[PDB]
Symmetry: C3
Subunit: 323 residues, 3 copies
């Protein structure tokens, strides 16, 4: 069973999982989502206590862990940012061992991947990465569940998508790893200086060879987006990035009437954010990486994607800790 | 009535009919009794609630948490963050995301327009734990408290005075509530600190229909004469002018005597500056030779004071809001 | 199997309890630990709501309270450090009376013992001290359970232990009070300026005289540790303090000076035992040392019981809550 192989695993990065393991998590996320909506959800974390360590705040990721935990019968302790990071006055080795004695599972959101890998080695319970500098694996699981729901029977391995703008960061990295694992066709469309780290690219190309996937890095929007089922962006220099804004024209360049728009959030798409009025003045634009028109269109699936953060985090905890 | 309230927001008392408000108060009394008898039935089992506090209030937060726990719900407390909603992300976007994950949302914060936006976009019940303009949960607690302490009198038969600075959420809400419930309210304070003139006019129109009365006066003796309840709240180097302006409106034993009512009771939303057991309270009182500000220790700790029953009733009335709107 | 109970009592400091009452909290902690591990735990705080007030942050104490409560069926509101300290905008008497109307029990961690005593006088519900300037009673219950688990049939009154370094603080104070109450032999081993408050020492000597306990204060390590079942230390911090405290480092040589093959090492945590912390490494490096109050070799040895001791924070807080609020 992929189920037996996932028990007691940490969830630190998608590089640590096989194609089939990732597909299992996504399929479990879909089952849990269906069960919650039907009122038939079976609690598999009943009596479990979970610690949520946020060295950097993220309300979106925190809420997704909390609600998943509550729904599954667990209780949570939220430990927010504090000015004294782990490793300042107490080693991560020591912190991990103490937390592991008290809690049944631990989430960690913070800085370097090295820190969460250390937590994962010493806690003695499942550790789950809610974001590090290098990777954002729970986001990409949500993104993949969302693509499946909006791609009308197409499997991941059949899907083409482009990520626009600054790809040299956790969400870029993870999207590229995920695409390679699952056999997808991913284009990273942005200035060459902001493509992902070349060593990660090479590792992903090798994975993609095994899966039938494709990774294209390009400065050319028209060629990057052509034929895409999804277009994805994130916040991101302005003069440099402006050509990569997702507007209706980019949508039209895909040549695909069913193209959908994704964004991990939060997004600068208008004047209503405080930055929005500033920059609509400061560079004469209404919205940055995406326009209000695209964000609020029927092409936009950003809020289904946000909701799926909870279902996919729930699957991670249920697969690894669930009883 | 119960069916009318299902899935509604609780944003301000202006959004509710007389009978709905009476229903929420009666429910609060039932839930209080059930809790004390150990017969409380959980109606929020399995529900998840988000508590957004853009400005911290431990009192309101604890009332919401305890009410939720007692009813079988779970809570996520999201406290002040240095970035107010609308900085990195619009309230429209924040609402739509929270609304996908939670079953109910409390908001405590700044302008009424913000909570109204949250209430428009969330798609689940949104409850106002305080905004600049209104504090509706406090006033439900207050009205329950009055009914418990008025010996069979109905709200429509009650007379009360609010002393001091009325130009704020609690004053606004007390005036709306009184009008909706047909009560006789006196706002007693400097004219500059009466409630907004447009709201007053709106409340006069409501009061005309309900049999209520709204009197605004600078005259303490005339304002408090015949009252069943006297209500105040805090007024405040920067505060000297406000203390001198408000000092005539201090609730002391003499004001109680001016009611002519042996049974008069004293209410305060808290926290209160009634002695020198706070840093700010002692400082400012000392600066004027006072002991206690808006109310005296003698009144606050007397048998006439019901402030702690009133504070407790915060929880029972928040519980009723959540049960009526989200309960099943 | 007791004649008394602690129902509706506060837990403010060990001085407030008799020898038998302390023993009962320790025995209950053990039973609760056993039940959790066996999956037979019965929830005695079902339906109870607890407020956790931290004026000063302690993730370790907070997590212990939260897990204990969850395991027992209770729910919790964590009120962290916030810029409004109690007594700023509102008196403690007023805060206490409001919290006591809403919650079934209240933990307080903060500043002076006087504050928590006032809370405990006015709340009308049980109040538990998670740490004040003067006392750390929950830590010492965990320490005593840990000692009993690792001492091979010996009762507290038969145990001898030494606390090394800076004893003039809550943990030193509580260890001394507890040792006195339970009839133990405690040695406080450190520079004389950092022995516990002289009035408390006198009070503890009077208690010890009634229980068969012994309290020894000494600057001499070899004499202080000789025969000890346990060696305990805590962080002592900085140049003047380090030179002063350095002779009291727990290293393998101090373990050897006990003459006891079964000696165990305890530390309330966190500990500066190596260079895997920013603060620990900077300070140790400027002074040429790998670890401060204890060495890596001791801390990671089979003599070290610090992670059992950390786990036992939870079991013992659970006992305090069950005993005083449990239904
Ligand atoms: Cl995120
Ligand atoms: Cl990843
Ligand atoms: Cl209102
Ligand atoms: Cl309030
Ligand atoms: Cl103590």
């Amino acid at each position: 069973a992929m189920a037996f192989n996932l028990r007691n695993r940490n969830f630190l990065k998608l590089l640590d999982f096989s194609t089939k393991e990732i597909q299992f998590l996504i399929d479990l996320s879909a089952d849990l989502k269906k069960a919650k909506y039907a009122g038939t959800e079976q609690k598999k974390l009943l009596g479990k206590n979970i610690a949520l360590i946020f060295e950097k705040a993220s309300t979106r990721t925190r809420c997704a862990f909390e609600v998943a935990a509550f729904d599954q019968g667990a209780q949570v302790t939220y430990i927010g940012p504090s000015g004294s990071q782990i490793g300042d006055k107490e080693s991560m080795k020591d912190t991990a061992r103490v937390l592991g004695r008290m809690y049944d599972g631990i989430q960690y959101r913070g800085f370097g991947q090295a820190i969460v890998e250390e937590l994962g080695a010493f806690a003695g319970v499942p550790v789950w990465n809610g974001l590090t500098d290098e990777f954002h694996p729970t986001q990409i699981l949500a993104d993949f569940l969302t693509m499946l729901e909006h791609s009308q029977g197409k499997a991941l391995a059949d899907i083409q998508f482009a990520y626009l703008g600054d790809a040299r960061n956790n969400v870029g990295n993870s999207l590229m790893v995920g695409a390679a694992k699952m056999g997808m066709d991913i284009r990273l469309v942005g200035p060459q200086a902001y493509w992902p780290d070349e060593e990660l690219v090479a590792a992903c190309q090798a994975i993609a060879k095994q899966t039938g996937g494709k990774i294209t890095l390009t400065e050319n929007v028209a060629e990057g987006v052509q034929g895409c089922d999804f277009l994805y962006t994130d916040v991101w220099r302005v003069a440099l990035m402006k050509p990569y804004q997702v507007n209706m024209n980019v949508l039209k360049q895909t040549g695909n009437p069913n193209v959908k728009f994704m964004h991990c959030l939060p997004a600068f798409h208008n004047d209503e954010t405080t930055i929005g009025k500033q920059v609509a003045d400061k560079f004469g634009m209404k919205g940055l990486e995406v326009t209000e028109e695209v964000f609020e269109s029927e092409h936009s699936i950003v809020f289904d994607e946000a909701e799926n953060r909870m279902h996919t985090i729930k699957a991670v905890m249920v697969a690894t800790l669930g009883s």
